[PDB]
Amino acid sequence: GAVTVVSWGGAYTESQKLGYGDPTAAKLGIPVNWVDYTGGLSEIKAQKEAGAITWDIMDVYAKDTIIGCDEGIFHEFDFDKDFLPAPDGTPASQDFFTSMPSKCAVGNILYSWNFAYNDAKIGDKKPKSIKDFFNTKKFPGKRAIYKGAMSNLEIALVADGVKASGAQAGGDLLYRKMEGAGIDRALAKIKKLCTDPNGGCVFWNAGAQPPELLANGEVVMATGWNGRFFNAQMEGTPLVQVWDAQILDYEYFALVKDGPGYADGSAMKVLAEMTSTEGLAGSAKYIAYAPWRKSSIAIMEAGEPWFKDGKTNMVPHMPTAPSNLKSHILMNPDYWADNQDEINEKWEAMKAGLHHHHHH
């Protein structure tokens, strides 16, 4: 019987299919099929409440591993029994480079939220910083920003000169500066960008939209996920990524309880093979996202140039390359799991106000 995996489409799903989905299906004799979504838990909640679950494995935001565990949607793993050791025998829990954010999480890759411009369209002046993203005088034009408050409030505060720490024990220090007053400042900063006659905002929802909007000249700068920009660059689109105030984030799979392949163990077998050392390394032959396992990272590094063409080195394109980390923010998933409802109410009220005061 087939196992249904849910992921984010475009270049990301392709990297998973080619790197580890199709190999897993062929090895195990369990078909592995892919469904596109755009994140969150609303679809799976609707399926579960209807008693009609068709999804088996979900590629999920870090915050959704926490929420989906707490809501009883996802299976709590017994990590070193359920996931495979590294080839040298290292248990999975010691091979994955840090701890899981929830008992329902297993890592796949790390990705960055950053931004890009089209070098052929932007003009002679070139954006270089997150402050430039907000600078409508030096760089007039529309911006594309993510549909949700998450990631936007962080970059708005850093563009306002509030300091992030990047990764350290206890998470990024930025989040302690995102109480009520900091949230209000971040909302005001975004509202200012989107209301400026020399700015304005397109809200993107799907990962393919930021590179497409830049390729077509619909915005002058767009936030997005670095692997989507990387894919467009490798296809010949003259985008340039800016890594100042990039947000380093961690992605996961979760196993849907009561999905079609849950009781018979088929979904778990697929998941263990997809998240193997070889599988996670294989995905990085296709897209610039870093494997979660130390063993997989070591394979990629030893095998450079690791890209599918046998000539492009992948390490300099990774979210974790030191050159790309110089001013990063580390995403805090507990913050968003805990506070997204309260924040989203204020965020959506801000977005509704953009329309209500908009004159055709």
Ligand X SMILES: C[SH](C)CCC(=O)O
Q: Quick one: DSSP state of residue 49?
A: H
Per CB under 6 A, 227 contacts ligand X: yes
Which of 95, 154, 212, 251 touches ligand X (CB under 6 A)? 251
Contacts of 263 (CB under 8 A, 6+ apart): none
Q: Which two tokens stand for residue 110?
A: 């790390």
Q: How far is the CB of 134 from ligand X (least distance, A)?
A: 23
CA distance 202 to 212: 12
By beta-carbon proximity to ligand X, the closer residue of 135 and 231 is: 231
Residue 355 beta carbon to ligand X: minimum distance, rounded to whole angstroms: 27
- Applying CB under 6 A, which of residues 225, 230, 243, 335 lies at the interface with ligand X? 225
Contact between 228 and ligand X per CB under 6 A: yes
What is the secondary structure of 119-145 as a DSSP string? TTTS-SS---SHHHHT-TTTS-S-EEE
Q: Is 228 annotated as a binding residue?
A: yes
8 binds ligand X (CB under 6 A): yes
Instruction: Using the CB atoms, write b or e for 101-137: b if 16+ within 10 Å.
Output: bbebbbbbbbbbbbbbbbeeebeeeebeebebbbbbe
176 known ligand binder: no
Residue closest to 343 by CA, chosen among 145, 150, 67 = 150
Interface with ligand X, residue 115, by CB under 6 A:
no
CB of 218 to ligand X, least distance (A): 20
Report the C-alpha gap between 180 and 343 in whole angstroms. 9
Q: Closer to ligand X at the Cβ: 94 or 237?
A: 237
Where does this chain touch ligand X (CB under 6 A) — which range of 64-72, 183-191, 222-230, 275-283? 222-230
Stretch that binds ligand X, among 27-35, 130-138, 221-229, 232-240 (CB under 6 A): 221-229
d(CA 16, CA 280): 9
What's the CA gap between 266 and 283, in Å, rounded? 22
CB burial of 45-58 (b: ≥16 within 10 Å; e: otherwise) equals eebbeeeebebbbb
Q: How many CB atoms lie within 10 A of CB 220?
A: 22
Within 262-301, the residues that bind ligand X by CB under 6 A are none
Q: Judge whether 340 and 253 are in contact, CB under 8 Å.
A: no
Q: Which of 62, 66, 161, 160 is CA-nearest to residue 113? A: 62
Residue 317 makes contact with ligand X by CB under 6 A: no
CB of 207 to ligand X, least distance (A): 4
Note whether 19 binds ligand X by CB under 6 A: no
Range in contact with ligand X (rule: CB under 6 A) among 50-58, 220-228, 268-276, 298-306: 220-228
Among 12, 83, 146, 252, binds ligand X (CB under 6 A): 12
Which of 75-83, 136-144, 223-231, 296-304 is the region at the interface with ligand X (rule: CB under 6 A)? 223-231
Smallest distance, Å, CB 83 to ligand X?
19
Question: What minimum distance in Å lies between the beta carbon of 38 and ligand X?
Answer: 9
Whether the upstream peptide bond of residue 305 has omega within 30° of 0, thus cis, is yes
Q: Which contiguous run of DSSP H or E holds residue 192? A: helix 180-195
Measured from the CB atom, the residue of 199 and 319 that comes closer to ligand X is 319
Query: Which residues in 54-83 contact ligand X (CB under 6 A)?
Result: 59, 61
User: How many residues of this chain interact with ligand X, rule: CB under 6 A?
Assistant: 10
d(CA 349, CA 356): 10
CB of 263 to ligand X, least distance (A): 27
Rounded to the nearest 10 degrees, what angle do helices 152-159 and 180-195 cross at? 90
Nearer to ligand X, 227 or 259 (CB): 227
Element (H, E) at 273: helix 266-274
Q: Which of 21, 182, 207, 291 binds ligand X (CB under 6 A)?
A: 207
CB of 109 to ligand X, least distance (A): 8
Residues of this chain that interact with ligand X (CB under 6 A) are 8, 12, 59, 61, 111, 207, 225, 227-228, 251
* Residues in the annotated binding site: 228, 289
* Residues in the annotated binding site for glycine betaine: 228, 289
